[PDB]
Each structure stands twice: as structure tokens, then as C-alpha cells.
Amino acid sequence: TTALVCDNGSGLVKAGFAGDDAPRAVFPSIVGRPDSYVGDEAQSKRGILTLKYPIEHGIITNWDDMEKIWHHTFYNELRVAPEEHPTLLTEAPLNPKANREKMTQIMFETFNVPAMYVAIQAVLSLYASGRTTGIVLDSGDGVTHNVPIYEGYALPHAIMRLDLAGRDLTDYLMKILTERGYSFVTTAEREIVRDIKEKLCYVALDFENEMATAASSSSLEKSYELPDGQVITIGNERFRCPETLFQPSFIGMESAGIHETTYNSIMKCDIDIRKDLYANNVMSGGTTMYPGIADRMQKEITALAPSTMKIKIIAPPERKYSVWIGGSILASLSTFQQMWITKQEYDEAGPSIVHRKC
Ligand SMILES: Nc1ncnc2c1ncn2[C@@H]1O[C@H](COP(=O)(O)OP(=O)(O)OP(=O)(O)O)[C@@H](O)[C@H]1O
Ligand SMILES: [Ca+2]
Structure with missing residues (x-):
């Protein structure tokens, strides 16, 4: 009877139960082949595997692998029978009609959900x-x-x-770090630079003033110890990386x-x-x-x-989890209970039913 909330992002899946203040499961939205591995285990074994992201720029592009992720989510992470829970999914703004339909179809036809909904x-x-x-x-x-x-x-x-968004900010940090010039190639060093990005980067209140400070002092510098023990320093890279959000020309956009x-x-x-x-x-x-x-x-x-x-x-x-939190609240509202698309409703109409109700 408890509803499920699945928030699928380009990089991370956030999934759980409506009514909870937090998702039970958060893991990388990846599938790896040398059987198949999904999420965390696929991430652990990145050396052996070739990874693929089923969601690109917020749009599900690989449906076969998206099914593996939903499967892993229901059965491994949440440990539920999807056919027993109303399921709320999420989508990106301006998600194509065909995409919301294919999502709907899969929920009802492959996962046999009793009801579902797709929210922005x-x-x-x-x-x-x-x-x-x-x-x-x-x-x-x-x-x-x-x-x-x-x-x-x-x-x-x-x-x-x-x-x-974030993956582009990681790539840019990797680029400018190598101009400094360290060396960060692998998927390993990719996690490493994503970690540096997330622990040492910040946004300058005044970019030009911050650069000048970085140039006239080593006060903005911070060290970071790599897995192997090496230690690296980053000064202005800390604020140059996210500055890109304000100035997309930094990565040629x-x-x-x-x-x-x-x-x-x-x-x-x-x-x-x-x-x-x-x-x-x-x-x-x-x-x-x-x-x-x-x-x-x-x-x-x-x-x-x-x-x-x-x-x-x-x-x-x-706010790393706001979307999920919002779905948890929405899905648990008495006023929303009639908004779920039911399997009977789908059975009559078809996937197109998603435009009417969502
Ligand atoms: N503290 C932090 N500072 C900077 N970036 C961060 C921080 N924590 C997480 N990120 C970045 O946020 C991104 C993941 O956030 P989120 O879960 O909102 O994305 P997503 O839903 O998977 O993707 P999208 O919404 O683009 O489809 C990653 O790039 C990650 O590095
Ligand atoms: Ca998201």
C-alpha cells in the first residue's frame, strides 16, 4: 500500500518510499558489462567493465538499460514487488511525449505496477x-x-x-588541473576529481576580485590527498570551475x-x-x-x-535530494490519490493516457 518514489537522474538514482524524509537508496545511474552490473557494484568494478549511462541530459536514451536500473531499484535496493506499490517516477522539464509514454508502458507492462505517475x-x-x-x-x-x-x-x-551541469564541471576541473599540471585520466581519477570538485570548489562573490586574491596570495589554496598518497594543491581552480555556470564561455559554450x-x-x-x-x-x-x-x-x-x-x-x-523529498510528500498526499494513473485506466486508454493525467 506504501507508494514508491523513484527519482532518476543522469548521474544518480534516488529511490524510496513516500512518507520518508529521505531516499533509502542513492546510487550511480550506470550499467556495466564486462552478466550485468548496476549502480554501486558496476562502479566498484569499473576497471573490468565498460559503463553506460541510460539517462543523458535528463532524458532516458537507453531503455533496455533503464529497465535494468528500475529492476535493480525495485528488487535489489528497495526490495519490493513493484506490482504491489503505486509508483511515482520523475522526469525532466520538456520531456518528449513519446518518452513519458514509453515510461508508462514499461511500468505497467514490464513491472506490472497497480498505478503510477510521472512528475516534473x-x-x-x-x-x-x-x-x-x-x-x-x-x-x-x-x-x-x-x-x-x-x-x-x-x-x-x-x-x-x-x-x-556537474559532469561538465568535473571535466573542466580535470582540464584546468592538468594545465597546472597534474595528471588525471581514468574513471578512477574521474571520481577523484569529482570528489575534489565537491569538497574544495566554491563560487566567488566577485570573480575578478577572487582571481586577484589568488594571484597575490596563497590563502585560497587548499591541499587534497589522493588515494595513492600524493598531495595536490588547487588555488583559483576552486572557484574557476563553478564560475563556468555564470560564464559558459569557460568551456567554449x-x-x-x-x-x-x-x-x-x-x-x-x-x-x-x-x-x-x-x-x-x-x-x-x-x-x-x-x-x-x-x-x-x-x-x-x-x-x-x-x-x-x-x-x-x-x-x-x-537540495541534493529536493526532487525526491517533493515526490515523497506529493505521493503521500490524500489530494493526490486520485491523480495516480491506475492499471485499469491504462488498460483502457494506452500509454497516451499519461498526457491526460500527468
Ligand atoms: N557538494 C557539491 N559541490 C558541487 N557539486 C556537487 C556536490 N554534491 C554533488 N554535486 C554534483 O551534483 C551532481 C549530482 O546531483 P543530482 O543528483 O542533482 O544530479 P542528477 O539528478 O543525477 O542529474 P540531472 O538532474 O542533471 O539529470 C554531480 O555532478 C555531483 O558531482
Ligand atoms: Ca535530477
């Missing part, structure tokens, strides 16, 4: 923020989106997408930074709701965990918004 990730994070109106900046491992939401529902005409996509998203919305979007800017996803990013957004958004506008950036400490 960013909407779910807003709900975890205690709100139904606001604009969410969701940045994970594969994609970044700005999603303005009004009274519970996303405004799709106004959603912005930026193909630049011709795109507005996250401060501007936020602005552009608000400007595609009705004038009368902008005040509320500016006062309710919620940060979501792992790539929004950089210290100083909330303050930098506040500064950048202030510079762009009308002079008198109240700007507020909400950056919940649990």
Missing part, C-alpha cells in the same frame, strides 16, 4: 521548499533547467534549458549563464507573477551545492531585476 523534477523541488509558486533552478549531473511554476504547475513556455537563463525565464512569464518568481527563486540539485552560489545568484539577479524588486534565493541544505 523541478516542480517536486518547489514543493519540498514549502511553496507552489516560484522559479526553480535545478542543476544536476547532466542538465540545468529554470522552471517557473505558478500555483502548483510548471509554465512550459517559460522553461529554459542549459546543457551544462555560447550560452547565457544561470543568472541570465533565470532572468530570461522570468521574462517569458506574465508580468503580474514576476514579483513572486523573484521572491521565490529555489535552488535544486547537486550542482547548486557550491558554497557562495546563493549569494552570487542574489547579486547577479539583483543586477538584472528592476531596481525595486525583492529578490530571494532559497537554497535548502537538503
Whole structure:
């Protein structure tokens, strides 16, 4: 009778039970072949295996391997019979109709779920923020989106997408680190540089002032001990890596930074709701965990918004898991119980039924 919440990301799957304050399972969204290995075990044995990510930039692209992940999730991680639980899944903003249908079809036909629903990730994070109106900046491992939401529902005409998220920030850190110049090739050293990124990187409040500080002192420098025992130092790489979110030209992207996509998203919305979007800017996803990013957004958004506008950036400490938390809350609501697509409903309509109800 308990509902399941599965939040599938490009890099990590977050899964659990509705009503819980946290997912029971969080693991890499990967499948490895030399049988098959999924998640953590596939990560452990990366030397022997060739890995594949079934979700790219938030869109499920390898359905065969996506089935392995859902299977592993239900049977190994959550240890449930999917046919006994309503299941809530998540999807990226502007997820193709065909994609939501194929998801639906698989849940009912392969997993035989009694009921299901597919919710938009960013909407779910807003709900975890205690709100139904606001604009969410969701940045994970594969994609970044700005999603303005009004009274519970996303405004799709106004959603912005930026193909630049955590994996790109890891690659850039790897690049600039090698310019320094250390050596980080393997999938091993990839985890290593992802770890450095997550423990030592931060976002400068003023980029040019921070560089000058880095150039006139070794005070911003921090050491990092590698598995083998080697020790490395990074100074300005700490803030240059995430600066890329504000300045996509750092990795050769011709795109507005996250401060501007936020602005552009608000400007595609009705004038009368902008005040509320500016006062309710919620940060979501792992790539929004950089210290100083909330303050930098506040500064950048202030510079762009009308002079008198109240700007507020909400950056919940649990934001690596906001999407999941939002689904856990939504799926447990009495008011949502009629929104589930039931197997009888599917049995009559077909996968297309997902557009009507989700
Ligand atoms: N403390 C941190 N500082 C910087 N980055 C972090 C931190 N913690 C996690 N990340 C990054 O967040 C990303 C994973 O976050 P999240 O789970 O939001 O992504 P996802 O849902 O798998 O991907 P997407 O939403 O793009 O489809 C990874 O790139 C990871 O390195
Ligand atoms: Ca995500």
C-alpha cells in the first residue's frame, strides 16, 4: 500500500518510499558489462567493465538499460514487488511525449505496477521548499533547467534549458588541473576529481576580485590527498570551475549563464507573477551545492531585476535530494490519490493516457 518514489537522474538514482524524509537508496545511474552490473557494484568494478549511462541530459536514451536500473531499484535496493506499490517516477522539464509514454508502458507492462505517475523534477523541488509558486533552478549531473511554476504547475513556455551541469564541471576541473599540471585520466581519477570538485570548489562573490586574491596570495589554496598518497594543491581552480555556470564561455559554450537563463525565464512569464518568481527563486540539485552560489545568484539577479524588486534565493541544505523529498510528500498526499494513473485506466486508454493525467 506504501507508494514508491523513484527519482532518476543522469548521474544518480534516488529511490524510496513516500512518507520518508529521505531516499533509502542513492546510487550511480550506470550499467556495466564486462552478466550485468548496476549502480554501486558496476562502479566498484569499473576497471573490468565498460559503463553506460541510460539517462543523458535528463532524458532516458537507453531503455533496455533503464529497465535494468528500475529492476535493480525495485528488487535489489528497495526490495519490493513493484506490482504491489503505486509508483511515482520523475522526469525532466520538456520531456518528449513519446518518452513519458514509453515510461508508462514499461511500468505497467514490464513491472506490472497497480498505478503510477510521472512528475516534473523541478516542480517536486518547489514543493519540498514549502511553496507552489516560484522559479526553480535545478542543476544536476547532466542538465540545468529554470522552471517557473505558478500555483502548483510548471509554465512550459517559460522553461529554459542549459546543457551544462556537474559532469561538465568535473571535466573542466580535470582540464584546468592538468594545465597546472597534474595528471588525471581514468574513471578512477574521474571520481577523484569529482570528489575534489565537491569538497574544495566554491563560487566567488566577485570573480575578478577572487582571481586577484589568488594571484597575490596563497590563502585560497587548499591541499587534497589522493588515494595513492600524493598531495595536490588547487588555488583559483576552486572557484574557476563553478564560475563556468555564470560564464559558459569557460568551456567554449555560447550560452547565457544561470543568472541570465533565470532572468530570461522570468521574462517569458506574465508580468503580474514576476514579483513572486523573484521572491521565490529555489535552488535544486547537486550542482547548486557550491558554497557562495546563493549569494552570487542574489547579486547577479539583483543586477538584472528592476531596481525595486525583492529578490530571494532559497537554497535548502537538503537540495541534493529536493526532487525526491517533493515526490515523497506529493505521493503521500490524500489530494493526490486520485491523480495516480491506475492499471485499469491504462488498460483502457494506452500509454497516451499519461498526457491526460500527468
Ligand atoms: N557538494 C557539491 N559541490 C558541487 N557539486 C556537487 C556536490 N554534491 C554533488 N554535486 C554534483 O551534483 C551532481 C549530482 O546531483 P543530482 O543528483 O542533482 O544530479 P542528477 O539528478 O543525477 O542529474 P540531472 O538532474 O542533471 O539529470 C554531480 O555532478 C555531483 O558531482
Ligand atoms: Ca535530477
